[PDB]
Design a protein around this ligand. Structure first.
Ligand SMILES: COCC(CCO[C@H]1CC[C@@]2(C)C(=CC[C@H]3[C@@H]4C[C@@H]5O[C@]6(CC[C@@H](C)CO6)[C@@H](C)[C@@H]5[C@@]4(C)CC[C@@H]32)C1)COC
Lengths: 88, 296, 22, 49, 145
């Protein structure tokens, strides 16, 4: 087992840190995070300014869902429903 | 030698009588000199060292040979400062000790530096317009009461050359694809100066400025706020997701972004490269409050 | 030659553990 | 898998138990430091015949 | 507990088995040091320069510059490592090992007081604690100090 360990370690680090595919995956996930953040920024920018009432309600709908109390209530309801369906 | 003590006492009395008086002029100096050890001032030890690219507030005139100034830094204290004629005498002494520009330290600048936002792409396009609109709304709403917003339509990049009635370049000013008849530029400059004279922090929405280097030789010397996207790929995806109309203008936006990237960091004053809107907003607000306290 | 391969599969699991260590 | 993942967690735990004992190098190099500290203590012998 | 003992033994052997044993592992250098202790049957202590060329010509294939004995880079290995001439070309085993380290390391010829002196004086404090057994500071000055 120790010999197989050494054989695997001889390649898990060498020739792997060179191309840095782990760094590539980290860059991909960082890019996804930055994209979602900037898209949220753009949505905020377009929302900050028939249709006027709809735009006004858009701000309140976007703000309400982000509240932690709403998230706690939703997760509690989901857990209760899952227990109910698992009450069998 | 009681005359020196008498004049020192008189100067100290005048200072203490006018320590709290308003500011006469705003000064932006690009020359380095140490005045702390200068005993030539009437009140020895009360000199202020003015260095390159420093901002000062001139309060009043002691005489033609000495004036009164304060530093715009936080908790600044008013003291003596060489007068314009005294600055001329000091530079004469400096060139006497050693062996052109003749730029006075008291360069005519607004009361405090205006704030202008640049990046991450060409202004007037959808992405940059929304990104700067969000920040403008945040700045207006949070710091309402002592913050002013100013919009300028005409170009402001011409303030030193082609504005001196230079025969070579003042000819091509009407057919440069811009509303530039010099007179409106001067009117807007005077408008900026008079708005600054109110001693209320102001910002400029320069629809023409898209690069720091085109607003450097000007006498405004504004505050540059840089907001940038981490990756060009992210910017491209944002442009594609924004709509089907900016596809024709994607290349110019990318060109502007990559040109702005190459700008040295020292040219910019602050950097806002935080993905979250709140983080960048607070980062800008802290600097704004620090600057506001510095002049107050 | 079977079990070693399974152990190599376990080594692959170790590689999976490597995939779980990366 | 998951127990193995728990074991993988144990792996990380072992990586915390023994793999975090690398401390600070505090020498000129990382491998050449080992060579220097290994080749400076070596002493010649005689091997009498 | 057997898993713990396995982890202990593999960590103990990590600096032995999972090392650079591919080509130029430090344990290969240790084996060549043992060879040096064995490859010189004369064991005269002060091996002449005309005697090292006869037998010590083959120093080390991996660590050595090449198969151009006595020195592949004659200029570098006889100037940067000064030609040992303590007694008709006397060569010290410790001095030769230090020369091989210099081949592995990177310090220039005489005039390297900065890096070489830092290495040879930080011995006392922070590189290789040798406050005692100062005999090296009596055999290196012929070569390095
Ligand atoms: C200087 O080198 C160390 C350094 C720091 C990181 O340490 C790593 C070293 C190897 C080590 C300890 C690590 C992760 C998986 C570990 C393996 C999981 C497997 O679990 C077992 C246990 C028995 C079986 C039940 C399943 O297989 C072992 C065969 C296998 C194992 C214990 C062998 C050793 C491995 C961490 C850099 O290394 C990347």
């Amino acid at each position: 087992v120790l010999g197989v360990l050494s054989g695997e370690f001889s390649k898990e680090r060498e020739k792997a840190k060179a191309r840095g595919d782990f760094q590539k995956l980290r860059e991909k996930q960082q890019l996804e995070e930055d994209l979602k953040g900037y898209l949220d920024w753009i949505t905020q920018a377009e929302d900050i300014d028939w249709r006027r009432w709809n735009r006004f309600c858009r701000r309140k709908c976007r703000a309400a869902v982000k509240s932690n109390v709403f998230y706690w209530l939703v997760i509690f309801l989901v857990f209760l429903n899952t227990l109910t369906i698992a009450s069998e | 030698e009681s005359a020196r003590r008498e004049v020192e006492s008189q100067a100290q009395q005048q200072l203490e009588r006018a320590k709290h008086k308003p500011v006469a002029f705003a000064v932006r100096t690009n020359v380095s000199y140490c005045g702390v050890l200068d005993e030539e001032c009437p009140v020895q030890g009360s000199g202020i060292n003015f260095e390159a690219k420093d901002f000062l507030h001139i309060k009043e005139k002691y005489s033609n040979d000495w004036w009164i100034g304060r530093l715009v830094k936080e908790g600044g204290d008013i003291a003596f400062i060489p007068s314009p004629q005294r600055l001329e005498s000091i530079r004469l002494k400096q060139e006497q000790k050693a062996r052109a520009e003749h730029v006075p330290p008291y360069d005519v600048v607004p009361s405090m530096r205006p704030v202008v936002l640049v990046g991450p792409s060409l202004k007037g396009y959808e992405v940059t317009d929304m990104m700067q609109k969000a920040l403008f709304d945040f700045l207006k709403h949070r710091f309402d009461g002592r913050i002013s917003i100013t919009r300028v339509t005409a170009d402001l990049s011409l303030a030193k050359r082609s504005v001196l009635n230079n025969p070579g370049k003042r000819t091509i000013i009407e057919r440069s694809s811009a509303r530039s008849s010099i007179a409106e530029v001067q009117s807007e400059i005077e408008r900026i100066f008079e708005l600054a004279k109110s001693l209320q922090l102001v910002v400029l929405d320069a629809d023409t400025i898209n690069h720091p280097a085109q607003l450097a030789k000007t006498s405004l010397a504004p505050i540059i706020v840089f907001v940038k996207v981490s990756s060009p790929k992210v910017l491209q995806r944002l442009i594609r997701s924004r709509g089907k109309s900016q596809m024709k203008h994607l290349t110019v936006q990318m060109m502007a972004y990559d040109k702005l990237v190459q700008c040295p960091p020292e040219s910019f004053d602050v950097i806002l490269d935080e993905n979250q809107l709140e983080d960048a907003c607070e980062h800008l607000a802290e600097y704004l409050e620090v600057y506001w306290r510095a002049t107050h | 030659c079977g079990n070693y391969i399974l152990l190599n599969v376990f080594l692959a699991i170790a590689v999976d553990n490597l995939a779980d260590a990366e | 898998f998951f127990m193995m993942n728990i074991f993988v967690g144990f792996v990380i735990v072992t990586f915390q138990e023994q793999g975090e004992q690398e401390y600070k190098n505090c020498e000129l190099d990382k491998n050449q430091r080992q060579c220097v500290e290994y080749a400076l203590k070596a002493r010649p012998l005689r091997r009498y015949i | 507990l057997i898993i713990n003992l396995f982890v202990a033994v593999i960590m103990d052997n990590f600096d032995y088995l999972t090392r650079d044993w591919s080509i130029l592992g430090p344990h290969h250098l240790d084996e060549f040091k043992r060879i040096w202790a064995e490859y010189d049957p004369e064991a005269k202590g002060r091996i002449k320069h005309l005697d090292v060329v006869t037998l010590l010509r083959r120093i080390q294939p991996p660590l050595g510059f090449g198969k151009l004995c006595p020195h592949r880079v004659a200029c570098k290995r006889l100037v940067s490592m000064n030609m040992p001439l303590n007694s008709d070309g006397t060569v010290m085993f410790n001095a030769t090992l230090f020369a091989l380290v210099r081949t592995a390391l990177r310090i220039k010829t005489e005039g390297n007081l900065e890096q070489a002196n830092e290495e040879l004086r930080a011995i006392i404090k922070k590189i290789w604690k040798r406050t005692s057994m100062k005999l090296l500071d009596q055999v290196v000055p012929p070569a390095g100090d």
